[PDB]
Design a protein around this ligand. Structure first.
Ligand SMILES: *CC(=O)NCC1CCN(C(=O)C2(Nc3ccccc3)CCC2)CC1
Ligand SMILES: *CC(=O)NCC1CCN(C(=O)C2(Nc3ccccc3)CCC2)CC1
Ligand SMILES: [Mg+2]
Ligand SMILES: [Mg+2]
Lengths: 5, 236, 236, 5
């Protein structure tokens, strides 16, 4: 899963 | 609600304790209480709010994906019928997730966004609105799925417009918004080229502005820049 | 309760799904529902019950220890007064922990233990009873603390007596009971020498019986033996 | 913390 903040 | 009798400052104190104890559901309930006092949030308090709900919904999303995968496997050719339980339990987790999202969107609509006049606060809240509509979109399958997707897009776009006008390209809020909107493009809107373009342009504009920063600001900005690079690496 | 309308088999199915999703609170609620159907539990079902509640209470214990440490630091000389919030929140977590323990002890008393006639089942349940009284003891400070400690001791001792008569020294239930009763001695009863003696004697009696075992049984028994060794290493 | 099962 791609990075999110 | 249940937190109506507790002082604002005590709620914030307890949220910090809950974070140290890794009690994110409690943290979120304390922060909801604090928001419902009706006063604007400081930067530190916005961080507490976001961390709490990120961790709660993150756990729900991870569980939903496990269950959805089992459900998908059960509907392949040759899978022996096991009855309604996998769907029911996925639905249960999905309904709980949707409830958390509705709670966060509710706090933003009543009345965090309308009272936020400074660019950092307004962008932060509009980014959150995008994020929680994006989580709704991840599980949506009905007549409203397109409107949910467009609600996320609209929130992210408003935030992008403000961030570009009012904040430097290294601002962590601006960077985080771009990171997340890029993921929206890739994962939700079926727009991988938009996702890639956004991440690349954001990275490169930040890179060009690092020279202006102190060591502490440089650390903050480069952490998120690395997340942009990590996604680009995954996608290219 | 809320699970009264769900089939026993569906509850067990869902407990397994919850475990895969790392949704231990749900797992525990499903297993409570299954126990409340009133039928005895199989070995697999006893494992599900134990895993669920172990993970729920484990998380509560870890949080309680974080909070208790902050509370202790706040009561040292030179600590600035921060009001009642740390105590209140520790109390909140403590009350939730106690509730979980009371729920497990309730299932064991009504009516898992009385219906368990086979040594493996009766020892397993009496070990659980010891364990959940031990968690109550960890947070106890009142008129009943000695009785809570003695309730754990009595449960563990009954289980030990049965296990020694009815099960081989390599039986994983016997080994696990001894591991936990040894920790009770060390941590709760202020009896480190008893703790050490128990762990050592258990290890050595198991070692002498490994020759009887298949490869799969050997794996099961040696895993717990290593936990005994790990504790002995910590304590000596 | 010591091991328990
Ligand atoms: C003034 C204000 O509203 N600050 C919020 C604060 C910004 C820094 N920050 C972060 O960098 C991290 N989280 C995050 C970044 C960007 C957008 C939203 C959240 C990234 C590690 C924490 C915390 C929030
Ligand atoms: C027949 C029966 O009641 N079996 C229960 C089952 C025994 C094996 N087991 C374990 O070895 C582990 N947990 C545990 C061991 C001893 C006592 C209680 C629990 C140790 C890793 C799982 C699971 C339960
Ligand atoms: Mg553009
Ligand atoms: Mg002895």
């Amino acid at each position: 899963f791609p990075a999110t903040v | 609600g249940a937190m109506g009798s507790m002082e604002r400052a005590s709620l914030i104190q307890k949220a910090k304790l809950a974070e140290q104890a890794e009690r994110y559901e409690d943290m979120a309930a304390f922060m909801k209480g604090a928001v419902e006092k009706g006063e604007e949030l400081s930067c530190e308090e916005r961080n507490l709010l976001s961390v709490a709900y990120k961790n709660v919904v993150g756990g729900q999303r991870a569980a939903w994906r496990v269950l959805s995968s089992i459900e998908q496997k059960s509907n392949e050719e040759g899978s022996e019928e096991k009855g309604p339980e996998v769907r029911e339990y996925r639905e249960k987790v999905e309904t709980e997730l949707q409830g958390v999202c509705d709670t966060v969107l509710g706090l933003l609509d009543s009345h965090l966004i309308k009272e936020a006049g400074d660019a950092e606060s307004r962008v932060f809240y509009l980014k959150m609105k995008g994020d929680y509509y994006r989580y709704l979109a991840e599980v949506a399958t009905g007549d409203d799925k397109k409107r949910i997707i467009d609600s996320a897009r609209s929130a992210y776009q408003e935030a992008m417009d403000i961030s570009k006008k009012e904040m430097p390209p290294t601002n962590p809020i601006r960077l985080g918004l771009a990171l997340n909107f890029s993921v929206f493009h890739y994962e939700i809107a079926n727009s991988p080229e938009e996702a890639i373009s956004l991440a690349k342009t954001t990275f490169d504009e930040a890179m060009a502005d690092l020279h202006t920063l102190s060591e502490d600001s440089y650390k903050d900005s480069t952490l998120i820049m690395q997340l942009l690079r990590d996604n680009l690496t995954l996608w290219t």
